[model samples]
Target chain A: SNAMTARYIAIDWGSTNLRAWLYQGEECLESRQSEAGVTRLNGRSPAAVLAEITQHWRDGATPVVMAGMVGSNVGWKIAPYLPLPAAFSDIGQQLTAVGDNIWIIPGLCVSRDDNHNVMRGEETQLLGARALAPSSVYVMPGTHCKWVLADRRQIHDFRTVLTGELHHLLLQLSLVGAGLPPQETSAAAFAAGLQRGINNPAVLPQLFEVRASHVLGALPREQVSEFLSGLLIGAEVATLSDTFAGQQAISLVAGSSLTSRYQQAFAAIGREVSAVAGDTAFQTGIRSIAYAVAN
Target chain B: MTARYIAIDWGSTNLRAWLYQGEECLESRQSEAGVTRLNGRSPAAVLAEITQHWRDGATPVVMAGMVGSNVGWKIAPYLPLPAAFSDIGQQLTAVGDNIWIIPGLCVSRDDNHNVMRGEETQLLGARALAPSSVYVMPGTHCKWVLADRRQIHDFRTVLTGELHHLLLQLSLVGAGLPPQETSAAAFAAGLQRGINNPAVLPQLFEVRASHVLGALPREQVSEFLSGLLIGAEVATLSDTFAGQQAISLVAGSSLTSRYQQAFAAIGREVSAVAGDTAFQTGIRSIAYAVAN
Candidate 1:
């Protein structure tokens, strides 16, 4: 029973959820999660929320390290974005101090001439991915899917595609979502959509087919979501073809389902990808950051 | 006022009835009643309501648009495309005695097909504007048609404005949408991006990136979205007409300005024609055909 013997805590407080891990030695003794995500906190201090959730570990001098949107403007404290070509070591050194033993990791930013993109929790996951390959491409799929190119132990450049958010918007808001019956994922429909997305000259005009085909009864209502998912993912995968053409391997850091879907997309295009557990990478990255800050 | 004839544009959303004598509009009235809206109402009921006021001279009533679709009062058969301009007047559909609904046009291909009911009338009206020219009618469902002196050579439908609406209503992209305060600079920038980038799936993501980058303000989001949609449609359709002398834009006043701005962005010369007058001219053409 290592339940009460936890030595330290690592928390990943994102926009929609707050997750905490109680670590003793190299083992995570316990984990806690709540819907008290940053957005849901409604101005309640992160310290109050953190203390309430991790009250079991509060008595001890167990240092708490947190990451993700807790470092954003609306979160606990603002952690300025460290510019790209940044290493885990660089991100580790600039942890924002909010309490005696609480620290928050800084996010990273990539700026182009016209626009810029920022990532919060994913940088820590990237830090962990360095163990798999010192330099390679890593993809983190979520609301905003990030495609990263790492080289010489630093994240060189990256691109963000709104694949997941777009999916949410389509299924919940768009005409394509209307009149759809409850259904499971259709791999065949997905494959068809992916092919169309990859080859279609103009994707905007083709989107109407999701509804038009359904109305014409050429496409079943059940398969619409899968088709849309594939289309968006396929379009994103098409853009990365030239970049990953010669790379030895592409690393996908995500949940199992997403990892498999991305792998299928790459396989369809005659490329191969390896899946890396996202939680493991997050843990490793947080451990390294905690070690650096402690020293 | 010689109010012997009435012209109605009954669409999926609204029914617009106009009283005309020969080519002159004697009086104009509108009703929210449309095909989808007139649910549970019979054809006779709809007609009685439409002619309730001027039933005195309501004979030989002419109609266009969705009133002829499978969902309308009576299905006015679709006329196949590559149709001669004269074929439209020949295809006038008679639902009730002295009540004729204009047949819509259908353009088909091996891979794609499109149909237009009301806009066909608008195009016939544009024939009065130019005997031969390419015309772009910008609306919720934009139709770009190529018309020769004798026939409608080809037509294509693009969902640009619908995409704009979808983007605006999507909670993810349109969150915190401000009351629209249009900025020409923002619109110009968005139009430039859309025109330069033809493949739209990838371009769709850039719309959100604009917000994340602070390159666009909330007040200008609506205008920027409109510009992007119109720009994309113009870019795709402009390549369709290779050597047209000029592009005629047939639309209402507000959308006419938008389509003109989009056409100008592509370095194309354009002439504006009012959509209302086009309908009237179309009814005249169809009526003359009916008389013959």
Candidate 2:
């Protein structure tokens, strides 16, 4: 009777949210999202959190596929990073089994002497996008924006920029955007920020200009936040411009606002970008892994 | 007795006032009455609270610094730069009959823009150091000023100090840092990286990388941050200093040593001028201007 149902569960467990989708063949039949993200797991084993969510459908036979921080050191089980140039096919093969019917996808790590960077949830998104373009550049914008080079069905190389984290820090901690009025994104101010951001090292001393502009009455308070956002994005893209060389278009995976801002940034440099919904990518990735493990 | 003049440097953090009889210092008093702590209380009320101790024989009060800012007692107006040393005494704004607030200086250009308030008085005292030498004033927002004897030609403000504070307090960046005594060796290493690799945005990532790679211990991270920020600021400012014949750093004793160390890291010779001495001499200058 359970075999007649024919369903497999795929999950994207990140820092803030635990998202699970029930897949019947290629279609995501029913999906459930919860605050049981890694942060909320709270002294419970990853397996316990999964069991709590899947108790109603607990057939013990529906093999589940999980990805993201769930495999991090603090996750349910630590899955060692598969070195760069990691392949889509290889990701599913190396899945670490955490339960009788559940397995976790390993994350990716790039080790440079001093610039070591690691990502948990974005690897799956990258894997999903890899299906769309087996050999194309991708930009995943988030707390740590990831710019990746995928060629020949594998992630060849990547770099992480702290653009999103920098924005969060400025808004929450720094005096740069203390009491600005809330307003729409000023294209003119953003363009100015882009120009400054691209000009690195030389632009360091000029960071104070944001505050000085406000104090001097040259820039409105409301527009300062957008200006800062543009600056961070622009600076990040500028430093990575060479990496995007020879590519006509980049595949961007992010939310709508981030997608739009990054699109603007890429467009300014005469590059086109195709948008991929973050959830769609995540779903596609999880389903692929779930399908592979089932076979 | 009531005719004795007073000079005050009321900044964002604290207010320092000096009572002077002609060229001699009669007495000096300090209060925790910074403008920022005043919490929107009217300027007159805050000043009254500060002057309450000496109000019995209060004479003409000349205040400098943020007291002249828009949010302070009253906006004393900003004097356009290229102001000469001789014109310092003439830029006072008489807000009340006996209360004169000196105007801050506004420096502007398409590429660079900055403002200075209380430090203008210190610059006047540093004039006593050398009329034609480059003077560096280190503080929360460090200002590197180039003065020609009596002329207030130009100055640049770097947010290095602020950046250091930001890195120390940021959760992710400062996570690896452990509380410990300051280390000069770490400072030296950070300074080298700042000068050798001036690409600031890219270099920022290395701040975290150092901890991740175990290149530096947690106890050294704080000192490393200070060194890196100071190094970047000094490197950026020093590149534009071909015009100055001599370099003199004017700051408090602690900052004076910090600045001195940064200069040494860059292989430059610098003369240190005590900050309190500068403030005293500056208050004296402003008082003379108020007397005149």
Candidate 3:
């Protein structure tokens, strides 16, 4: 090893929260989490936020590697997206260094005639996922669900479905959510909506039907949120199915909060998926980056 | 026909009444007292305040829209289709001694379960003013009706108008957007994208994503959004209303022109009728019959 106390910091800085790990190569020594996400700076500079979190962990020799929205245009540094068809291994090599040992991992993007999509936090997760559970298709659910197609060599193409955002927006903002009581989990309601969404992927008309259904007593008022969650997830899977056609090997990468919903969505359609927690993938992914730099 | 009367088009958020003297509107009064926004006042009191000095002993009053719903002054039940024009005028629910509320239309088929309140009145007038194979009324909720000479056959309500409002005013898609301005180019660009992708459910969030990624302009979000929603609406229903001759857009000049642009974007020819004319003509025809 280069030094007896060779160590680095791995961060997953996002829009609303920042979680950092003081790692001694695959082992987190002291971890610190912050509400000072990239956008939640509150008039403080990113450097200031970073210094506050890793100040105690900072030795002049210790390096910091940050991923997620911290690499965005609005983040600490402008981390340009590496174009598509990029091999997973190639990512760790081509990182945007913000300072001495302080680097921002560049996100990946697909720019073509039919598609224009981007992903930041998920690229690191993809690398971790590739190592942990390699599959032909990866259905990573988040704010924007990235449905990626990969081969043995590189990631070819992908598309994003606004599954999570739509669910939140409809339940919180849209009229379908108007006058709702506090929502409780309803498996029956969710399954019903999932069936409806799968059978009828043309969802524009069905959206208003949600409001009408509840108003007409065909659906429960309190269960609208649960029902919509299934609808959006099911719709995403159904509409984007043709893109990943005949691909049996699929990995469902998400945290427990969302992993189960996607699992049910895939299972309802009679497709099987391998599961990986988002945090586990992120930790594995960030550890790889740290390991490589040490060598 | 030398009689004077009152014709009111009261909806969810607005109340507008016109004093018609011998087929001509003498004076008009408006209030924010829609059926849904009565605050604490009764619909009767709200109606009285709006028609202050306009109501007379001999002047008959006819009302349309949500005023006849279960939430309105009285529950004017929806006349199930296939309903004739005569059924709507014949089945006016009497709220007061001299006042009448027109019945709405409902479709309760398995494939389509829909309800329309005030647009039945507009459809009535549009049929007479600009008769067409299709009558698309663009408003807070757009109604696309397949109608002809005999009666109201079927219609679909797309929440395009309300969606535009909600997406722009409330959703994270509009969260950090600057104050938007009208941009025809942006609107047309969005229209083409929406029409091209008829499975537009995903396109909604991508608007926010694209702007965040610098693909779409922040300043033109509203205009672009309107066109996107309308274009997707037309695309989704294109198969149903496709190859139909003589499509008429029924709304005020603003929405009619906006929807007309979307129709023209797809090389479809559509006629336009002002919502005021259609509503007045419609309620006037039924009210005149009731008044005499």
Candidate 4:
């Protein structure tokens, strides 16, 4: 009766949002979501939130497994980071328990003299990505783009590029974004910016050109975001392509819209990739850990 | 007749005017009537209001900065370079009576399309005060100017200062950071990170991550970021002048000192010129010349 039946909850709760699924074996019983992320339970406890969301399908004995920032210091419990170079199975073994029948997955960190980086949620997504679309290089694009280097065995070093945040910062905070109209999609502008990104490592200085482009009417006023997105991703790809190249097993693990851009960026430099949906990887990664820990 | 004139610096956010009898500024006044915020008043009326009693019919008002732009009082077209220093004074755009606006400088090359307004006047003053082969004028838009003895050559603008403000005040890097204080150690460390790697732009995110992970202090982010941005600016843009040309760090603020430190870290020395002094000398030269 205590055997692993996949009859548990898998939750990916980050800083601002929470997503969960009720699973029985491989079939999803029901799915639920919360926007308040664990940080915003409005003074409520994480246990209260878990119980509130799971009240519909969960019995008192049902196991609840959570990942991402839920395991962070600010979350329900601090699930310590499993330091690299760590094998894939080490992640599931290091679950931190906050309550009875409840478990939170541990994050991963690269501790080196020259490198210091921390990712709360991406670690869980990395586990999922590895299982579904195995590759020598994993480029997880988001607010922080993670370029993970690994083989079929243990996960190795990774570099986090501030591509997405820089784009948002440039568009919303910097002068390049000042007084812009509502943004529209523009593939041509992205391609143009991508071309420039290919030549330059000085993205900071080039940010001013985004302003000059619109001010001089060389680019549409409403397409700064598109042009900037392409430039950042293109530059990021070009900057890392040399060091992370020569290995053909490349997978881009992100949402389809974001993955499409990176795919184009890689193709620009003569490469191809396998695509992995973010949610699929996260879910697959958690289900394995959830079932492993629950039984 | 007294060799006196009204020298004004009418920029985007503020207007400063000085009454000078030759080199002596008899009286000076400042106003919020920058070209951008004329308080819904005409530039002519705003100019009249500020120089109310400071001006007489022959007390010619000479203005520099955005007052020369199309959005300002009158369109003082930019003088295309490489322009001789004297060409600036000779080409002032007379808007009304003796009121003249100094034209800005523009560089239109295939690789660089750049323009400068008030800095042209600053450059004029800098050339007279502490001349160098290159001028690193730090401000909202830092201009790295290359010049010969008598002529202004090509230049490039590094958006370092503006990027610092935007990132610290508005972006996630500064988000949720505590009330910041100066940390020279943190700054030097950030400087080393940037200077050692010309490809240091990618490490900007690591600033935020370090603080979040307690690897760096929350309050010292401002200084660290300041050093990081300035360090990167110096490392990447210094190639434009390094070992090939002499440099003068120009500005009227403490940033001149900060920039000096960045230069020292990279084993280079630079002369310093105050922006206010440069402008005064620059404008006086033009005024005395136009007294022709």
Clashing pairs in 1: none
In Å, residue B152's CA in model 1 sits off its true spot by 4.0
Residue-wise C-alpha lDDT for candidate 3, range A30-96, written one tens digit per residue: 9899999989999999988998999789887787888998988779998888888998888888888
What TM-score, over all chains together, does every model reach?
0.87, 0.86, 0.92, 0.93
Give lDDT per model, in order. 0.76, 0.74, 0.82, 0.82
In candidate 3, which residue pairs get closer than 3 Å at backbone N, Cα or C atoms, i.e. clash?
Answer: none
What's the best-to-worst order under DockQ? 4, 3, 1, 2
Residue-wise lDDT of candidate 2 within A133-220, one digit each (tens)? Answer: 4337889998778888777567776777777777777766666677666667688888777766766434565666777777788777
The digit string of per-residue lDDT tens for model 4 on A1-295 reads 5434648888888778988899886778899899869678789888888888887777776788888888877788899887788898888888887877788888778756566666777877888888898888888998888888888888887778888877887898776788899999998989988887776666656777777667656678998899888888888987787777646658899999998998888888888899999988888888777767765
Pairwise TM-score winner, candidates 2 and 3: 3
What does TM-score give for chain A of every model? 0.93, 0.91, 0.96, 0.95
- lDDT per residue as tens, model 2, B143-228: 78876766777777776766777767764677545685688888878877777645555556556656654676778887777777
B185-274: candidate 4 lDDT, tens digit per residue: 998888887776556655777787778777789999988888888888888888767545447888977888888889988878788989
Tens-digit lDDT track of model 1 for B1-292? 3336778888877988877677777777777878888777875687678777765533468898788877788888778778899988777888877789998777555344456678888888888975447888877677778777888877777767666776777645676566878688878877887787665444555565566557678678878778877887778668866555778788899788877777788899887789877878888778766654
DockQ of 2: 0.39
Interface RMSD values, listed in order for every candidate: 3.0, 2.5, 2.0, 2.0
